[PDB]
Design a protein around this ligand. Structure first.
Ligand SMILES: CS[C@H](O)[C@@H](OC(=O)[C@H](C[SH]=O)NC(=O)CCC[C@H](N)C(=O)O)C(=O)O
Ligand SMILES: [Fe+2]
Length: 329
């Protein structure tokens, strides 16, 4: 068998308030989890995840092939050269099971200075027709802001955990400019399940998505109640229990860079499961020009031999690299 990873449940509600000592006690738990397997569940987060899941299902099960082409990113539709990030990521029956819809900051409108400048990694979201998907765009944009709020609270906990003031990350995480994304991923039930859409790990485990570190500062993930994630530890890959009431939190490789690997970006992978399920990550990305000077909380003077990296540079290069490593999703 495979052993269960230690993934503690942390009540993050104090991070929304003004009880400083309580917030430090949360920060301690985040530091412990970040130093151990790298994962925890955030509980008492305030978001209505059941409704998220229901609205997302209604979308995934009603969108049609026609709409998917019309919304498709460039990798699927050459007419959409501006859609590198945002839009529909199609399945390929018989070959590729997963499909998804990605959207960015709702404030990236046509008049946004970064959109006007055509700055990489900034795009205007694309949406289905309102009459075919009533309420969906409004729901989804509101979700963005709900999960942005949660992520800002979590960032105050990570900051305190690392010995910094609580706005150390959050001051770079701002509504007008964040590069954060929501991805609404559908993993289908298929009978028969084509083997070409199943990858095999070196240990024999059947996978839907291969080992990786996340391209994020942190990742704030809702998933259905179907076990599938595994984390590499010193003792090997361990299963992450599902919990469709909490958000699964981990660091991405920007956090690893900024902390000199004190908070590692944990390596993880997605087991193949023949189950209709959802995976709804929010990738907590900063602004394009955000730079945090790297540091090391294990060294007395806090100094690091890493060089500063702008978030936009990080992001543009990370997203390409992960496509090259593990394939276009
Ligand atoms: C449990 S790994 C993850 O949440 C999810 O996989 C992803 O979303 C992958 C790796 S991080 O998980 N991420 C990407 O493919 C990056 C999408 C980025 C997006 N297209 C953007 O432009 O921001 C899954 O397959 O269940
Ligand atoms: Fe991931």
């Amino acid at each position: 068998s495979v052993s269960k990873a230690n993934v503690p449940k942390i009540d993050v509600s104090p991070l929304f308030g003004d009880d400083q000592a309580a917030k430090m006690r949360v920060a301690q738990q985040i530091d412990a989890a970040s130093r151990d397997t790298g994962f925890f569940y955030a509980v008492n987060h305030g978001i209505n995840v059941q409704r998220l899941s229901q609205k997302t299902k209604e979308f995934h099960m009603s969108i049609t092939p026609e709409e998917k082409w019309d919304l498709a990113i460039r990798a699927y539709n050459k007419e959409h050269q501006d859609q590198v990030r945002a839009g529909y990521y199609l399945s390929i029956p018989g070959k590729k099971a997963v499909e998804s819809f990605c959207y960015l900051n709702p404030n990236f409108t046509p008049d946004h200075p970064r959109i006007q400048a055509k700055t990489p990694t900034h795009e205007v979201n694309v949406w289905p027709d309102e009459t075919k998907h009533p309420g969906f765009q409004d729901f989804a944009e509101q979700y963005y802001w709900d999960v942005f709020g949660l992520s800002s609270a979590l960032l105050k906990g990570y900051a305190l955990a690392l010995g910094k003031e609580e706005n150390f990350f959050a001051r770079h995480f701002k509504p007008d400019d964040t590069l954060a994304s929501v991805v609404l991923i559908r993993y289908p039930y298929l009978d028969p399940y084509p083997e070409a859409a199943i990858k095999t790990a070196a240990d024999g485990t059947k996978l839907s998505f291969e080992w990786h570190e996340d391209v994020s500062l942190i990742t704030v993930l809702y998933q259905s109640n179907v076990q599938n994630l595994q984390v590499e530890t010193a003792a090997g890959y361990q299963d992450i229990e599902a919990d469709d009431t909490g958000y699964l939190i981990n660091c991405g490789s920007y956090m690893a860079h900024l902390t000199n690997n004190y908070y590692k970006a944990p390596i993880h992978r997605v087991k193949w499961v023949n189950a209709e399920r959802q995976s709804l990550p929010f990738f907590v990305n900063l602004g394009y020009d955000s730079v945090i000077d790297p540091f090391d909380p294990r060294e007395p003077n806090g100094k690091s031999d890493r060089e500063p990296l702008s978030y936009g540079d990080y992001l543009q290069n990370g997203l390409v690299s992960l496509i090259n490593k593990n394939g276009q999703t």
